Every structure is written in structure tokens, then in C-alpha cells.
A paper describes a structure:
Crystal structures were determined for all potential bistable candidates (XAX_GGDQ, XXA_GVDQ, XAA_GGHN, and XAA_GVDQ), and we chose to focus on XAA_GVDQ because of the presence of a bound calcium. Detailed NMR and crystallographic characterizations of design XAA_GVDQ, described in the following paragraphs, suggest that this sequence may indeed populate both short and long states. In the absence of calcium, the 3D CM-CMHM NOESY and residual dipolar couplings (RDCs) were consistent with the short state. Because calcium-induced oligomerization or aggregation complicated NMR structure determination of the calcium-bound state, despite efforts to optimize pH, temperature, concentration, calcium, and buffer components, we turned to X-ray crystallography and sought to determine crystal structures in both the absence and presence of calcium. Most notably, the protein XAA_GVDQ adopts the designed short state by NMR in the absence of calcium, and the designed long state by crystallography in the presence of calcium.
We used de novo protein design to generate very closely related proteins that adopt two very different states—a short state and a long state, like a viral fusion protein—and then created a single molecule that can be found in both forms. Inspired by class I viral fusion proteins, such as influenza hemagglutinin, we chose homotrimeric helical bundles as the fundamental architecture. We decided on a design scheme with two divergent conformations containing a constant six-helix bundle “base” and a variable portion with three inner helices and three “flipping” helices. In the compact “short” state (∼66 Å height), the flipping helices fold back to interact with the inner helices; in the extended “long” state (∼100 Å height), they extend to form interactions with each other.
Numbering used by the authors:
A (entry chain B), D (entry chain B): 3 to 93
B (entry chain C), E (entry chain C): 4 to 94
C (entry chain A), F (entry chain A): 3 to 94
The structure:
């Protein structure tokens, strides 16, 4: 959409220079039509950005779940410590 | 986002009404609608920027945790010498 | 910039009041010019948000690449497990 | 057992000096009895060492199992990479 | 270990036989049995030492893996600057 | 030492042949002396194996202490998860 944004805006500026040269009701209306079409594209882009942000957060969420599991669980960790307590006793 | 989609719907309706019976009253009406739509675009953008800021700080915490996921070089240093010791007595 | 956004919008509202107070072709055109200038700044702010999102995704990509290497390589794991097997055989 | 070893051996050396002073069939037999009792204790100690070694290997085995799980599984890891491929595409 | 327990059983039997009807033939017999028991103690010890050597080398591999379990300081260095970058553009 | 073991045993076998060849009270006593000397070296070798086992257990103890800290502290994990929650709330 960033392409349509750049050009939807370039189109907009052309009409504006035009409008400022030969102001008329038709040119004003034409300029407003162009504005509306540019806002429609701004809205579309924003809707996409907000969607990208949502996916980013889901990826970040998965990253934390991974971090959550990187350690050694306290169930096996507890097993090894007792094993060591035992060995130290016998020894 | 909800407000955006509708302030854009409201904007498109005036535009065709303007294009139907154009008048100074309608042009001004349409401009007021544009301004209201732009103010809502601006709020959305500000929210997106706030979300980006919070996203970047979460990424920072993720990296802080990655830094600490390994085993300390102090503790790792003690074990190697322990190993060095053993391998000497043993031989 | 977020500031230039805030003010190209405040400027825009000022003209709109003027326009509604004393409507005229000159004021209408002036309001349209202000609109285009505000749209230009909306577009630039959007352009930067898209830039920032791409860098964020790149950073996320590095984070995952680091998570992939946090484990112990399966070449060392393979060697240790074999050692454990041999030991268990000799001791028994 | 290391205590009984040290003293079972000290006892042994006493008889030996004794034996070497007044050699006799009774002292020889007495010395052999002492030897046998010392070997019995050496065997007991060895049996314990071999048991300690067995427990050590079991602990080492658990340590490797832990190392085996410290990473992030290739099932979630695969999920995040696709999530990123998706994001990169849309974006 | 099996051989140990029995060369010790064999040794104890001669001892009581020696103590029953002591003779130079029996004393020499008992000494031969002792020597055979000691040779078997020595083999056991040598095996235990071999096991200790293999144990120590497994521990070395365990520590080598612990060293590599973290995230490289090179990769970790790249991400922080990435974060530094973002936080600058963003603000 | 493992070497002094090997040789106090070879020495021991030599006397035993002598003893069996020409038995005598002097040779018997001499064989017993050799035995005690071999037992003394068995005991020392055992004493070192017990020493080495204790250091091995100590090293194993450090390895487990390092495994306990390989995870990400639950204080950082707590903070990140909260951040994720807030973000999900603002974005929605």
C-alpha cells in the first residue's frame, strides 16, 4: 500500500497546484474527491499496520513460551540433587 | 479502527452528496468531515506508535533474558579447574 | 514526526473554524492546502512506522536464531551418550 | 570402611614385626589370619567403591538427559520461523 | 567382583583348614591363595581406575556442552545494537 | 600408585615360587612381609580412589548447580509475560 500512498499523494498535490491556479467549484470538488481517495488508502495502510502489529505480538508471545521452557525442569533437577545427597551420604 | 472505518464511510457519503448538489455549504461540510477523519487517523497513528514503543521494550527484556540463559563464566571457571585437578591426581 | 503531526492538525482545525466563520473560495482552497500538508505528514509518519516494523521483524528473526542455538549441539550429545553407554558396559 | 582399612593394616604390621622377632608356626598362622581379615576389608571397600561408581554413572546419565532438553524443541521453533516467514511476506 | 567374593571364600576355607591341622604344606597353600586373592584385588583396582578415567572424560564433555549452552556473544552483540537502533528511530 | 601396585605384585609372585621351591620358615616369613607390603599399597591406592570419587561428586554437584541456573529467571519471565498481556490489551 505504501506505493499507492506515495502516488495517491503525488496525484493529490497535482490537483492542489491546479486548484490554486484556476480555483473553481469543479476543481474544489475534484480536489476533495482526491483527498477522500487518499484517506481511504491511509486507512487501508493503517489497517495493515495494525494487523502486522498483532502478528508481531503473537510471535513475541511464542518467543516467551520458548524462553519459559529453556531451563531444566524442577522435577528432574530435584531428582539429580537427591541422587547427589545419596551419593554424598554413602561416600 | 472501528471509528476509522466509519468516519471514512461518513466521509464517502458526503462526497457523493457534494458531487450530487455541490454548494459552498456542502464543500464546507465535506471539509469538516475530512478534518474529523484526519484527527482520527492521527489518534490511530499515535496508538500504533505507543504499541511500537511497548513492543520494542518487550524485545529488550527478551534479549536481557537471552543474555542470562547461559551458565556464568565464574561458575564455569570453577568446574574446569576442578576437572583439571582431577585429571592430575588421577594420572 | 509525531509532533509535526500534532501541529499540522491543530493548524488544520484553526482554518476550519475560520472557514466556517467566513466561508469563501479563498478560505476553502486554503483549507484544502492545509489538508494536503497534513496528509503528507500522515504519509511520512506511516512510512516510518512501516520502517520500524521491518526492523522489529528483523530483530525478532535474530532472537529466534539465538533460540535455535541455545540447546546443546546434537554432536556433543551424541558423544556423551555413547560414553555413558560404554561406562555402563565396563562397570557391569 | 577406610577407617577399618587403616587399622586392620596397622594391626597387620604389628603382627609382622612380632612374627619377625619370634617366628613360630603359631605366629605365622596368626599373621595369615590377620592378612585374611585385612583382605576381607579390602574387598568390602572395593565393593563399596564399585557401588559408588554405579550411582555416579546414574547421576551423570540424568545430567545428560537434562542437557538433552535444555534447548527449545524443533516443534515450537518451527512454529516461530513460519510465523516470521508469514510476517515478512505480508510486510 | 564375582571372582573377588569367591577367591575370598576360597581363602577363608583354607584358613580354618590351616588352623585345624597347621603344617608347612598348609601355610604355603594359604600363601598361594592369598597371592591369588591379591592379584584379583589388583585387577579390580585397575578396572576401577579405568572407570574413573572414563568418568572424568564424560564430565569434561558435560562441561564442554555447558560452555556452549548460552547464546554467542557475537550474535547477542548484534541484537543489542539492533535494539539500540530501533529505540533511536522510534523516539 | 598403580605402578607400585603392579610391581609389589610381581615381586610377590617371585617369592611365592621361591617359597614353593624351597619352603622354609625364613621364606614363609619373607613371603608374609611381601604380602603386608602389597596390602599397604592396595590400601593407599584405595585411599586415592576414594579421594577421586569425592572430587568427582563435588564436580557433579557444580554441574547440577549450573543446570539450575541455565533457565531464564522467573522474575524476568514474570515481567515479560505482563508486558505481553498489556500489549495485547492496548492493541485490541
Amino acid at each position: 500500500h505504501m506505493g499507492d500512498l506515495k502516488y495517491s499523494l503525488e496525484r493529490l498535490r497535482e490537483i492542489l497546484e491546479r486548484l490554486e491556479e484556476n480555483p473553481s467549484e469543479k476543481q474544489i470538488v475534484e480536489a476533495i474527491r482526491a483527498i477522500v481517495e487518499n484517506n481511504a488508502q491511509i486507512v487501508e495502510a493503517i489497517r495493515a499496520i495494525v494487523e502486522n502489529n498483532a502478528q508481531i505480538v503473537e510471535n513475541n508471545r511464542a518467543i516467551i513460551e520458548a524462553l519459559e521452557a529453556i531451563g531444566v525442569d524442577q522435577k528432574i533437577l530435584e531428582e539429580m540433587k537427591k541422587q547427589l545427597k545419596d551419593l554424598k551420604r554413602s561416600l
